[PDB]
Amino acid sequence: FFHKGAKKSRFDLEKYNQLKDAIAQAEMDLKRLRDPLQVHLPLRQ
Amino acid sequence: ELIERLEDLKEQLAPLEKVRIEISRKAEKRTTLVLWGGLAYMATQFGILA
Amino acid sequence: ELIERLEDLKEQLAPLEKVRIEISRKAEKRTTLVLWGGLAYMATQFGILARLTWWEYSWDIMEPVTYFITYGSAMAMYAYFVMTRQEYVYPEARDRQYLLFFHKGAKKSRFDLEKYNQLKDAIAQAEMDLKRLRDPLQVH
Amino acid sequence: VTVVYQNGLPVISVRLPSRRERCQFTLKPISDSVGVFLRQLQEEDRGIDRVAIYSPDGVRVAASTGIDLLLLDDFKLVINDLTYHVRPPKNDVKTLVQQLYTTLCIEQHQLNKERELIERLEDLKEQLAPLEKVRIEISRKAEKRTTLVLWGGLAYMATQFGILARLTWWEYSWDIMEPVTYFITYGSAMAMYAYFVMTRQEYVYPEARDRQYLLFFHKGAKKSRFDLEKYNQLKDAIAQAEMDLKRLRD
Amino acid sequence: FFHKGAKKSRFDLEKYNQLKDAIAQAEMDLKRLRDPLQVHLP
Amino acid sequence: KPISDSVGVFLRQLQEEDRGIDRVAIYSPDGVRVAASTGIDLLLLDDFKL
Amino acid sequence: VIVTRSGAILPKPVKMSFGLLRVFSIVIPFLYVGTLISKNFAALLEEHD
Amino acid sequence: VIVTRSGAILPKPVKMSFGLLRVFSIVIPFLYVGTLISKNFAALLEEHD
Amino acid sequence: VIVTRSGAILPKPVKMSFGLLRVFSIVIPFLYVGTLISKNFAALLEEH
Amino acid sequence: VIVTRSGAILPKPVKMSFGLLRVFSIVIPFLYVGTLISKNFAALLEEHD
Incomplete structure (x- = not known):
C-alpha cells in the first residue's frame, strides 16, 4: 500500500532512502569519533 | 567537517518527509481497515453457522 | 580517575535498587497468578464438558458446543493480535504482562524509572571502557 | 525568547516591536552567521531603525560570527527600542608523547606476548586430554538416552494410533469413541501449556530435546564424578587465547 | 539438490567456496584501508 | 576558533565588519609581519601588534 | 528477554483507544448480519428450488 | 544449543522444584469444580423453561 | 539459508544412515501391538 | 520489518505473474482427478468385494 500510494502521489523514493542512508553513515562516523577524542583510547573499524 | 556535512543532510530532509508522512498516514489507513476486515470475515462465519 | 568514577556510578546505583527489586517482586506476584490461572481455566473447561457428555448427556449436542469453543479460541487468538499488534506466543505474552505490571508499580511507588534505566547505561559504557583501557596487547 | 532544537535546528520564536506576528525562525548552528x-x-519586517545583538555588558558582537558561538552564552537581542535577554538550554602533549612512545614499544611487545601465549595455549591443551576422554563417553551415554526419548515419542504416536484404529471399527462404535479421542487432543493441549508453565519454555522439538539433554548430561556426569567446571573453564581459556592470538596478525 | 547437481556436473564447490571467501576478505581489508578517518592515502 | 580560523x-x-577600515597588518614584537595563513594558536603564543 | 543487553528496562507499550469495546462492537453486529443472510438464503432456496 | 561458541557446556536449566504436584493440584481441584458446576446448572435451567 | 554472509555456499545437510528403514521398522509393529492389546484391555472390562 | 535500521524504506517485493490464476490452474484440473479416481475405485471394488 505504501508503494501504491507513492506511485499515486508521485513520490521519489530512491532519493529519500539514500538521503536517510547518508545521515546514518554520517552518524556512524560521528559515533566512532567520540571514542579517541574524549576517551583517548584507540579507534576501532 | 562531518557535523557540517550532516547539517546539509538534515536541512534537505525537511521538505521531503512531508509527502512521506502523508503517504504513510494514507497507506496505514487501508491496513488498519483490512485488519478489521480480516476480523469481519472471521466474525460473520461464526454467525452463519449458529 | 576511571576507577574512581565507576565506584561513584555504583554508589548512585546502590540505594534505588531495592525498591526496584520490590516492584519486580510485585510484578512477578501479579504475573505468576495469571500464568497459573491460565491453566486453571482449562482445568475448569475440561470438567465442564467431561462430566456432561460422557454419561450425563449426549455427544451429538455437546459437539456443536465443542466446535464453537474451539473456534472462539481461534478468534480470541486473533483479537490479541488486533489489540497488542504482535503474535500471541506463550513467552512473548507473559513478558508483556510482567513489563506492564512493572510499569504499573513504578507509579504506585514512583521511584524514577526514567532515571534508573538512564543510569544503567553509563555504568555499562564506563565498564566497557575500563576493560578496553587494560587491554593486555597494547601497553597502558 | 525560546531556543529549541528538538527539530534538529534551533528555532527562535520572535515577534516584532509594536507588531502582532509571532514568527518562527529556523537556522543553522554552525554554518550560519x-x-x-x-x-x-x-528583509521581511519594517522596523529596521536598529537590529543588533549585543553582549550583556553592552558590547556589540561581530556580524560575521557564528550562531553556535553566540548561543553558547547569553546575549541581548536588540530591535529598535527594547531588550530581549536570551538564555538558551545549556595534558594535550603528555597523551601525544604516550601515543608516540607506544609506537616504538609494541613492535617488541607483540613478539614478547606471542611466544608466551603459545605456551599458555599448549599447557591447557595438555590439560584438556583426559577430561575430553571422560566427557565424550558421558556425552555418548546421555546421547543414547536422548535418542531413546525421540524414538519413544514416535512409539507412543504409533501405539495410540493403533488403540484408536482397532476399537473404532470393531467392537465399539465411532459415535462413542469420538468423544474419547477428542479429549486426548485437549489433554495434549493442556500438557503443552503445562510444559511451558513448569519449565519456562515454548514447546518446540529441537529445544525440547536440548532441554532433556542437559537434564540427562549434567546428572550423568555428576554420577560419574566429573568436574564440568574444569572442562568449560579450559574451553573458555583456550578460546580466549585464540581470539587474543588472532588480533596479532591482522 | 545442489550437492548432487554439482557432483553430476563435476565442477568445484571447494574452489567456489575458498575463493569467494577471499573475495570478501580482500574487500573488507581494502575498505578498512580506504577509511577516511584513519589517514593512509592522502 | 583556534582550530580553523587563520x-x-x-x-x-x-x-567585512566596517568599511572605513582600509589597511590591516598583524606584526610581531619585532618589526616583521605575520602572513595570512598562520593559525591563531601560533599567533596567541606571544604579544603582538595590530 | 525483558532486561535489555545494557541492563536497563524496555519501555512501556501502547493500548489503542478503547480497544475491547470496539472489538466487542464489531463482533456483535456481524453475528446478526450473518443470521440475516442465513435467513435470506434459507428463504431464497426454499422459495426458488 | 549445547554448542557454546567457545566449545563450553551450558549451566543446568532450573527445574521448578516440587512443581509437579503444583500442576496436578491445580488441575484436579479445578477439574472437580468445573465438574460439579455443570450438573447443578443444566438441571437448574431446564426445569424452569 | 542458501549462502553465507559472503556468498559462499553452505556444507552438506546430513541425512542419517538409512533412517527410513529404521523408523519404518518402529512404526508398523508398534501400530500392530497397540492394535492387539486393546482387545486384552477390552476383554476384562467387558467381563466387569 | 517495515523500515530499515537506517530509517530507510524496504523496496517493493516482487510479484510472481498470474498468482491469482496459477493456483487455480493446478487446483481445478487436479480436483477432477480425485473426483474421478475414487468413483472408479468404488466401481472397481464393487465387483471384487
Missing part, C-alpha cells in the same frame, strides 16, 4: 541571519530577519 | 580570515572578517 549572525550578520546574515539578521539580513533575513530584516 | 590570520587572513580574521582580518577579512574585521574588514
